[PDB]
């Protein structure tokens, strides 16, 4: 029964954490766009990589 509970609600956690990884990934992509344009320095891009990892 506890395994059926985990199979019943771990999908609604894995989809949420995958959306979190995708949101942080496109956050890092926007921070890399800001860096390669030249607005912010390299340390904010390293903070974006810290959050994505």
């Amino acid at each position: 029964a506890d395994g059926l509970a985990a199979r019943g609600t771990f999908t609604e956690q894995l989809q949420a954490q995958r959306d979190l990884v995708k949101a942080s990934d496109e956050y890092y992509q926007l921070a890399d766009k800001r860096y390669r344009t030249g607005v912010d320095n390299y340390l904010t891009l390293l903070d974006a990589q810290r959050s994505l990892f």
Partner: protein, 52 residues
């Protein structure tokens, strides 16, 4: 090393050139003292004296 941006170097270079221009303003305003001759030639009276 790209530890700073290009923008926070560009505005710092702008502030450098603005302060250089302000020093140039002060240097011409100090060159306006000890009044230099505009053109070479023969000089007349000293219509003002020392202390006036």
């Amino acid at each position: 090393d790209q530890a700073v941006s290009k923008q926070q170097y560009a505005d710092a270079n702008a502030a450098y050139l603005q302060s250089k221009a302000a020093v140039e303003q002060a240097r011409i305003n100090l060159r306006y003292t000890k009044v230099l001759s505009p053109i070479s030639g023969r000089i007349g009276r000293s219509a003002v004296t020392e202390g006036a």
